[PDB]
A paper describes a structure:
Myosin heads comprise a motor domain (MD) that hydrolyses ATP, a regulatory domain (RD) that includes the essential (ELC) and regulatory (RLC) light chains, and a proximal S2 subfragment. During relaxation, two myosin heads pack together to form an interacting-heads motif (IHM; [Woodhead et al., 2005]). The IHM appears to form through key interactions involving the actin-binding region of one myosin head (denoted as ‘blocked’) and the converter region of the partner ‘free’ head. The blocked myosin head has a pre-powerstroke state while docked onto its S2, so ATPase activity is sterically inhibited, and the actin-binding interface is positioned on the converter domain of the free head, so that it cannot bind actin.
We first generated a new homologous human β-cardiac myosin IHM quasi-atomic model, and used this to identify residues at sites of IHM interactions. Human β-cardiac myosin ELC, RLC and MHC (MD and S2) were modeled as described. A rigid fitting of this model was done against the human cardiac negatively stained thick filament 2.8 nm resolution 3D-reconstruction (EMD-2240) using the Chimera ‘Fit in Map’ option. The new model fitted well to the 28 Å resolution 3D-reconstruction for the negatively stained human cardiac thick filament (EMD-2240). The SAXS data in this angle range provide support for the overall shape, placement, and orientation of IHM domains. Sarcomere proteins depicted are MHC (BH: gold, FH: olive), essential light chain (ELC associated with BH: brown, FH: purple), and regulatory light chain (RLC associated with BH: dark blue, FH: blue). First, there are neither atomic nor near-atomic structures of the human cardiac IHM. Although a near-atomic (0.6 nm) structure of the Lethocerus thick filament backbone has been reported, the resolution for the IHM is comparable (2.0 nm) to the tarantula structure employed here, perhaps because the intrinsic flexibility of swaying free heads limits higher resolution. Third, the tarantula striated muscle lacks MyBP-C and titin, molecules that may interact with IHMs to form helices that protrude from vertebrate thick filaments and limit interactions between myosin heads and actin. We found that only HCM variants were significantly enriched in many IHM interacting residues, most notably in those that stabilize the IHM (p=5.37e-16 vs. expectation).
Residue numbers in the entry:
A (entry chain B): 630 to 678
B (entry chain B): 147 to 339
C (entry chain D): 44 to 195
D (entry chain F), F (entry chain E): 7 to 166
E (entry chain B): 727 to 871
G (entry chain A): 824 to 871
Write the structure that this text describes.
């Protein structure tokens, strides 16, 4: 069911409310990412030009 | 790993060598600023996998394209996503105007299984009129220059340039690439998909 | 020490087999010196093979040819080796994998040890070593494994 | 006889229900002694219309080497086994060139065959080569020796 | 081989320190864990290549026994060459004649028409062929099944 | 002389697997007094072993006349050898009601057969039709076509 | 042709011989040999 402020899920209609849709997936990516081994590369920038 | 020093293949070497043995799920997180060549880097992570771990015939010295087609398709999808997703910003000619998360999958014994990729945001706002010196989504310029006189009719492109209204400022260039030949490459990448 | 009438026949048969020529000539290559001795029953490293090579050639094909006159003074030398191996060295060795006293071995962890250090096996030979059947997630055992190796 | 025992052979049984039935069907075109015989004088007669070539006084008993005498109903079995045995069949005749390839489904490498023919021990002559050249069945970049032999078996024609 | 005897078996953990410390291995630049083992850059790699030059005895004897396993069965190639090779000569000396021969093709077309062709031998094989195929299909179902 | 070949043979089922053989081996029972030369008396006795009468002497005498005379192991077989025309092969008769239609396997109505034989082709007589009709496995209005075809041709009726 | 001189010699005395003997039995038996082999081919590779 669509209860609005959005969207479809999540949720019903106001054209957009993408920032709420960026709540749902945000939980799904993060909590799992904690449980995964971190590999990292910290890339730095040398110039603006 | 002594012949395997501090170039991105190593971290990806050590991740693969590690993971296939321990069976716990893993990550590869690159941070940076505007044009911290992020996208160019991850393709290197993939270029370790796509040519090492998978069942690719190495025993001949050929430039390479020697299978397996999973590896070939996983590669091509990246340039494909770049053409559509990437535009250009004042700092970065290759501004991936979106975001993607990649869950690489591996099988029972050694080799590759697949990949689950989601997308965050996209700059749909820019399409009206871009600020300064930016370019709109790469896919456009490629279709304009490389397309033949036949497709030009059906597809309904202007013959002349500078007609297109959604392209603000003007026809801005990128240092060292064309617009035209990059089209034929990626279109074949679709056939390859 | 010197070769008995039975041993001379063993050496003659294998050598005569190795002579692969449309017009014959009675010679073996230095590379083929490997599997010759192996078929003869003596179990050598490639290090043992090259040790008795007339030419400081390493692995390649098309270097030196040896006659039976040369091959026998090779064989006669080889017979001296004592350290061939038993079963119980391998039992002691393969037990080291254990973590919980099961003597059970996962497939990936078992293929990798074969490939990595030594004279080494290939990806292909691993596919041959393990082609089933019907055990998932996905264990072999150390006892039955070694005994099949020695059994041939 | 133990050395007569080389490679090339296969053994069958006396009965035939309806398998070798084929000989009763064929009989009429060829027959000699209708009791059930082909004897020493019939090779000099019938084979003239069975072979592409010829018999000489030089190769008499050799051309009959496989069946030099009373080939009775009991004996026909060990001329048929001699099809699989003959003069080094299959196991030698075919496997001869077949063994060459270092990797798999090969074909004999033409030019290197020409090389060995003029070099390896007994240096041959030009006549044999030119007849052979026009008669080479080179399926694409290598001499198909396997078929150049195996044309006489398989199952997909019936002329001679 | 000086410090850790094998076959009648040692601790799960206590064995590793000698298998490490054999070729020395600098102390700081390795660490023990539970399942995952931890190494530094540099020190690991080349000492790990050196283990080819050093790892004789059992490691290479397993691989070597596998070499003997393989080779004892699958050397082939050169085997039947010499006998055939001589015969090739026995043919080559007479190539001008070869094509003019006996056994060619007369033996064929009927074979698709006839019913129960290869009887007697297959008759001897019949019972074992019937039984074992079922005996197999018994196991060759049931499982996945 | 290598231009005198005997090439090409197998058309259809010439010496049919269930007719030809069991005749040549039987010869020892027909050849009564064991000479190879079947007289009219060697026939006379063997048909007496078969059943009750047997063809008359003249009726056998014409069969002797079909041959160039001495019915021996040479002639009898050769006189049989050429004679293949007469009956039709099994599959050909068998497929008659099978090819009845494009679709598609039920049973063919005996009324349609009765309407055809009488009228579409060589007009069979009232006698000829119903006679051949009577012996029919009529599974309810439709004929078991292949079985009636078997009644036409199969392993069966001696003594001819 | 139900009254010809040389043809319909078939069953009355002839089956003192062999030839016919095995045929029909094998027709019923051969059915079994095929299907067991066919399944034996396809099965394992399905479970793969």
């Amino acid at each position: 069911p669509i209860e609005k402020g959005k969207g479809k899920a999540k949720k019903g209609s106001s054209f957009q409310t993408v920032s709420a849709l960026h709540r749902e997936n945000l939980n799904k990516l993060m909590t799992n990412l904690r449980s995964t081994h971190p590999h990292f590369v910290r890339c730095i920038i040398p110039n603006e030009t | 790993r002594s012949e395997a020093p501090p170039h991105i293949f190593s971290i990806s070497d050590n991740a693969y060598q590690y993971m296939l043995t321990d069976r716990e799920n893993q990550s590869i997180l690159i941070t940076g600023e505007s044009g911290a060549g992020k996208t160019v880097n991850t393709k290197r992570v993939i270029q370790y996998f796509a040519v090492i771990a998978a069942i690719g015939d190495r025993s001949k010295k050929d430039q390479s394209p020697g299978k397996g087609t999973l590896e070939d398709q996983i590669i091509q999808a990246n340039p494909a996503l770049e053409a559509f997703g990437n535009a250009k910003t004042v700092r970065n000619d290759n501004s991936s105007r979106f975001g993607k998360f990649i869950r690489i999958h591996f099988g029972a014994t050694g080799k590759l299984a697949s990949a689950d990729i989601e997308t965050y945001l996209l700059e749909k706002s820019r399409v009206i009129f871009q600020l300064k010196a930016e370019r709109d989504y790469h896919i456009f310029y490629q279709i304009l220059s490389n397309k033949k006189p036949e497709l030009l009719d059906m597809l309904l492109i202007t013959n002349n340039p500078y007609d297109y209204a959604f392209i603000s400022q003007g026809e801005t260039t990128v240092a060292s690439i064309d617009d035209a030949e990059e089209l034929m490459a990626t279109d074949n990448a679709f056939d390859v998909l | 020490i010197e070769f008995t009438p039975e041993q001379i026949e063993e050496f003659k048969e294998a050598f005569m087999l190795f002579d692969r020529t449309p017009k014959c000539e009675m010679k073996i290559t230095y590379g083929q010196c490997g599997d010759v001795l192996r078929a003869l029953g003596q179990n050598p490293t490639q290090a043992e093979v090259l040790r008795v090579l007339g030419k400081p050639r390493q692995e390649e094909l098309n270097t030196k040819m040896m006659d039976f006159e040369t091959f026998l003074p090779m064989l006669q030398h080889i017979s001296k080796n004592k350290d061939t191996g038993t079963y119980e060295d391998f039992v002691e060795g393969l037990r080291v994998f254990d973590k919980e006293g099961n003597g059970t071995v996962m497939g990936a962890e078992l293929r990798h040890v074969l490939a990595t250090l030594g004279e080494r096996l290939t990806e292909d030979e691993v596919e041959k070593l393990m082609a089933g059947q019907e055990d998932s997630n996905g264990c072999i055992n150390y006892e039955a494994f070694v005994k099949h190796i020695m059994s041939s | 006889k133990k050395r007569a025992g080389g490679a090339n052979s296969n053994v069958f049984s006396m009965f035939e229900q309806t398998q070798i039935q084929e000989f009763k069907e064929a009989f009429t075109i060829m027959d000699q002694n209708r009791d059930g015989f082909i004897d020493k004088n019939d090779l000099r007669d019938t084979f003239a219309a069975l072979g592409r070539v010829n018999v000489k006084n030089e190769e008499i008993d050799e051309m009959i080497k496989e069946a030099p005498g009373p080939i009775n109903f009991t004996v026909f079995l060990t001329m048929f086994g001699e099809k699989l045995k003959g003069a080094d069949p299959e196991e030698t005749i075919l496997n001869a060139f077949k063994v060459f390839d270092p990797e798999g489904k090969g074909v004999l490498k033409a030019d290197y065959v020409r090389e060995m023919l003029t070099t390896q021990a007994e240096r041959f002559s030009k006549e044999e080569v030119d007849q052979m050249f026009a008669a080479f069945p080179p399926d694409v970049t290598g001499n198909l020796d396997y078929k150049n032999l195996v044309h006489i078996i398989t199952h997909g024609e019936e002329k001679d | 081989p000086a410090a850790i005897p094998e076959g009648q078996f040692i601790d799960s953990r206590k064995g590793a320190e000698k298998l490490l410390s054999s070729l020395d291995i600098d102390h700081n630049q390795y660490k023990f864990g539970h399942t995952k083992v931890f190494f530094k850059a540099g020190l690991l790699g080349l000492l790990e290549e050196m283990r080819d030059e050093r790892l004789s005895r059992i490691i290479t004897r397993i691989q070597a026994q596998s070499r003997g396993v393989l080779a004892r069965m699958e050397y082939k190639k050169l085997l039947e060459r010499r006998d055939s090779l001589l015969v090739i000569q026995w043919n080559i000396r007479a190539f001008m004649g070869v094509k003019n021969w006996p056994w060619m093709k007369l033996y064929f077309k009927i074979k698709p028409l006839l019913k129960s062709a290869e009887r007697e031998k297959e008759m001897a094989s019949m019972k074992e062929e019937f039984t074992r195929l079922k005996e197999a299909l018994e196991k060759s179902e049931a499982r996945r099944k």
